[PDB]
């Protein structure tokens, strides 16, 4: 019962991340405004979820099979495109980019990218590196390439408009993001909070 | 002597990319024949900056699109309506902007 | 849906390149242990600007 | 349920709730549905909506 053995505990689950909010007309004036979501895919980044509550009780993690999911809360009459991709290198910050087309293109260039209208649903797969490197579970520290295994950027390609042609300006909510994940934790512990 | 090779070999490679968004002009900003030209995007490999095909272009001297095909990915429902014409002119110097007769342009 | 692929494939490619010239320091400019370090050239692929690798 | 009174014990060897909508695709609202196996687990006591979800 007092075993000093370490082993990966690969356990599965699902979680609710947050509700997206298409930026609309007013709040959309430049490129960086078109970045709705910048959410690290570190296990311990989603506070109340089960994944993070578990992560708090280990040192390390590694997404063996993760996939962000979009579930719309709108009709099919509204119109706006969305692009989503998970950059496996956190320190790649597109916010510095001004040219919007350059932004969408460096997004599409990432392999796991996805484009979808905010009236249907699609899945954003996380692509896993090939070296077996484990990542630390605690809050982000001096460097990020240790903790974060990826970063989910959600983009607004077009402008938001309604049944009629008038474009909305009220910055409404379109859907919700879920995470159907499979992770492997290595070292039992407790992280400070 | 350290003689670099002398084989001028061709490297053919394929893949899709992304030019830009199309912005229809509406009734306000459509007051002329030039306003009806929404996209003027050269097809030189070195014209697509953010892409990596253009970057590779700098690693060679000459190019030739053995096959190219622009694809339109819409974002609207079937409720809205507007006709569009798209043609890849093989002569860049042919400028439609100089035209005034909209029908001639079309 | 326009879903870009999900295949993280490896692309191995080979070729030679050119780092820089070596400048021996002579008797005048060799007055210390640091002066005897002629080349400090990182080997990160992104360190060779002019090259295409 | 009526038959249930004719026996003492039961066990759902298989159950599956099915949602039969009545609206078009014009309206939109997200829904979550989960069969909790512990009846005493009451979500009403919660205040943090995100925790509930």
């Amino acid at each position: 019962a007092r075993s000093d053995v370490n082993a990966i505990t690969v356990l599965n689950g699902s979680d609710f991340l947050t509700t997206v909010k298409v930026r609309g007309s007013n709040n959309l004036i430049d490129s960086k405004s078109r970045i709705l979501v910048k959410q690290p895919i570190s296990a311990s980044s989603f506070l109340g979820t089960r994944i993070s509550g578990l992560s708090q009780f280990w040192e390390r993690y590694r997404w063996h099979k993760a996939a962000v999911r979009y579930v719309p809360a709108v009709p099919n009459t509204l119109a706006c495109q969305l692009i989503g991709y998970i950059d496996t290198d956190p320190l790649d910050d597109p916010n510095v980019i001004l040219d919007v087309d350059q932004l969408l293109r460096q997004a599409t260039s990432q392999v796991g990218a996805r484009q979808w209208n905010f009236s249907d649903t699609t899945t954003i797969p996380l692509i896993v590196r090939r070296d077996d490197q484990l990542y630390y579970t605690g809050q982000d520290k001096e460097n990020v390439r240790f903790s974060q295994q990826g970063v989910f950027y959600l983009l607004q390609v077009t402008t938001l408009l309604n049944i009629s042609g008038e474009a909305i300006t009220n910055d409404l909510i379109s859907g919700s993001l879920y995470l159907d994940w499979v992770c492997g934790f290595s070292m039992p512990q407790i992280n400070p909070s | 002597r350290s003689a670099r090779s002398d084989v001028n070999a061709i490297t053919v490679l394929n893949g899709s990319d992304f030019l830009t968004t199309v912005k229809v002009r509406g009734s306000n900003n459509l007051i002329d024949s030039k306003s009806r030209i929404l996209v003027k995007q050269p097809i030189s490999a070195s014209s697509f900056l953010g892409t990596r095909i253009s970057g590779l272009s700098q690693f060679w001297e000459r190019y030739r699109w053995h096959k190219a095909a622009v694809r339109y990915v819409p974002a609207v429902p079937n409720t809205l309506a507007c006709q569009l014409i798209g043609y890849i002119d093989t002569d860049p110097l042919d400028d439609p902007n100089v035209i005034l007769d909209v029908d001639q342009l079309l | 849906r326009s879903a870009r692929s999900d295949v993280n494939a490896i692309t191995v490619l080979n070729g030679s390149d050119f780092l820089t010239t070596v400048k021996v320091r002579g008797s005048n400019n060799l007055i210390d242990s640091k002066s005897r370090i002629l080349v400090k050239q990182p080997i990160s692929a992104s360190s060779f600007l002019g090259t295409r690798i | 349920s009526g038959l249930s009174q004719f026996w003492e014990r039961y066990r759902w060897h298989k159950a599956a709730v099915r949602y039969v909508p009545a609206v078009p695709n014009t309206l939109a609202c997200q829904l979550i549905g989960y069969i909790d196996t512990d009846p005493l687990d009451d979500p009403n006591v919660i205040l943090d909506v995100d925790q509930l979800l």
Binding site: D120 | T11, G15 | - | N25
Partner: peptide, 21 residues
């Protein structure tokens, strides 16, 4: 030659009204 450089795929989906049962 380098195959599958930037391959993109498209799969159109309809969006009717009043899915009936």
């Amino acid at each position: 030659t380098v195959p599958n450089f930037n391959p993109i795929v498209a799969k159109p989906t309809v969006a009717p009204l009043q899915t009936n049962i």
